[PDB]
Scaffold this active site. Structure first.
Site, PDB file in Angstrom:
ATOM      1  N   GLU A  49       1.116  -1.262  -0.042  1.00 56.22           N
ATOM      2  CA  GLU A  49       0.056   0.114   0.128  1.00 56.22           C
ATOM      3  C   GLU A  49       0.815   1.378   0.107  1.00 56.22           C
ATOM      4  O   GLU A  49       1.684   1.407   0.939  1.00 56.22           O
ATOM      5  CB  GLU A  49      -1.039   0.010   1.275  1.00 56.22           C
ATOM      6  CG  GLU A  49      -1.839   1.300   1.427  1.00 56.22           C
ATOM      7  CD  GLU A  49      -3.229   1.297   2.147  1.00 56.22           C
ATOM      8  OE1 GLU A  49      -4.288   1.765   1.763  1.00 56.22           O
ATOM      9  OE2 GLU A  49      -3.104   0.641   3.107  1.00 56.22           O
ATOM     10  N   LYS A 131      -7.917   5.025  -3.830  1.00 59.17           N
ATOM     11  CA  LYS A 131      -8.524   4.572  -2.692  1.00 59.17           C
ATOM     12  C   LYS A 131      -9.673   5.528  -2.254  1.00 59.17           C
ATOM     13  O   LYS A 131      -9.503   6.799  -2.439  1.00 59.17           O
ATOM     14  CB  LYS A 131      -7.727   4.230  -1.537  1.00 59.17           C
ATOM     15  CG  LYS A 131      -8.458   3.783  -0.231  1.00 59.17           C
ATOM     16  CD  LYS A 131      -7.320   3.882   0.870  1.00 59.17           C
ATOM     17  CE  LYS A 131      -7.421   2.691   2.066  1.00 59.17           C
ATOM     18  NZ  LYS A 131      -7.060   2.977   3.335  1.00 59.17           N
ATOM     19  N   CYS A 165      -6.612  -1.874   1.808  1.00 63.45           N
ATOM     20  CA  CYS A 165      -6.803  -1.886   2.956  1.00 63.45           C
ATOM     21  C   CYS A 165      -8.229  -2.073   3.344  1.00 63.45           C
ATOM     22  O   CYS A 165      -8.812  -3.210   2.770  1.00 63.45           O
ATOM     23  CB  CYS A 165      -6.221  -0.593   3.838  1.00 63.45           C
ATOM     24  SG  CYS A 165      -6.371  -0.975   5.586  1.00 63.45           S
TER      25      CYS A 165
END
Length: 287
Positions: A49, A131, A165
């Site tokens: 990430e 994201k 995530c």
């Protein structure tokens, strides 16, 4: 291309530590990783990430009133829309005939995003998404993506899907990728943060993904050395907060580990993903 289950693909998940506070230094490790992996005939690779230049550990750990220097710095090492970084990767990918999945702190116009980039084996950048919901401390750093970001991509190695995530708890994203028959799902988490609890949660989360979707899952997580934790804070009492939560792993459609997963230090989790497994799975259930 169009959808094919006869492939067998060598994939890798990379747990590495970045270089603390240098886009360029971190980028050298990335290129090295790709190259090392090429040595073993890897055709697809997934990094942690927001690995480039580094995950923003500072936002978890510093009070807001003092985040400015760290924030600025990150902005200075952050990655443009397309640029140097993009081209460098597009080339590694092309050169090694590899599909590359890379998370990056993207800058655009004095704003930062968590951006997942996918490069095809011809070196083409075939997916860019942000994201959608930065979580918790991440809200001090990144803006939001659109939900138009929920598409899969056909790739030299099959059809890929990617989330960051806790995007994995967003049901729209899950069904979106499942409805499009993603064959290999790529997850990215930060690494080296919170502890066992976060690690247990990643694993459960991502292995369940494989199970529900009936796809391969690949998950990558960063790493920090003790020296690097100091670089982030001199407060040793904080260092538990910058430890654990590492699960670099490759998971079959039945939830099995296809290789020993990595939680400590730094390495490539590597496995052969046999696509016929995806189809033996779906055929075995009826209705």
């Amino acid at each position: 291309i169009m959808l094919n289950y006869t492939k067998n693909i060598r994939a890798a998940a990379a747990q590495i530590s970045p270089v603390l506070f240098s886009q360029q230094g971190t980028m050298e490790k990335v290129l090295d990783a790709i190259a090392n992996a090429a040595k073993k005939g890897v055709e697809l690779i997934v990094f942690p990430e927001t690995f480039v230049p580094y995950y923003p550990y500072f936002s978890f750990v510093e009070p807001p009133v003092l985040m400015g220097k760290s924030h600025l710095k990150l902005y200075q090492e952050a990655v443009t829309v397309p640029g140097k970084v993009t081209q460098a990767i597009a080339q590694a990918a092309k050169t090694h005939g590899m599909v590359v999945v890379l998370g990056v702190n993207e800058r655009e116009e004095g704003s930062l995003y968590n951006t997942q980039l996918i490069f095809d084996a011809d070196g083409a950048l075939v997916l860019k998404r942000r994201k959608i919901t930065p979580t918790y401390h991440e809200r001090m750093v990144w803006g939001q993506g659109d939900g138009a970001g929920l598409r899969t991509v056909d790739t030299t190695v099959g059809r890929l899907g990617a989330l960051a995530c806790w995007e994995h708890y967003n049901p729209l994203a899950r069904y979106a990728l499942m409805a499009q028959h993603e064959q290999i799902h790529c997850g990215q988490f930060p690494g080296s943060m919170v502890g066992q609890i976060f690690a247990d949660q990643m694993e459960v989360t991502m292995r369940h993904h494989a199970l529900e979707s009936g796809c391969f899952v690949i998950n990558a997580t960063g790493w920090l050395t003790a020296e690097q934790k100091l670089q982030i804070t001199t407060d040793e009492k904080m260092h538990q907060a910058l430890s654990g939560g590492c699960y670099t792993a490759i998971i079959s459609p039945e939830g099995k580990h296809l290789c020993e997963p990595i939680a400590e230090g730094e390495g490539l989790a590597i496995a052969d993903l046999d696509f016929s497994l995806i189809a033996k799975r779906k055929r075995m259930m009826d209705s």
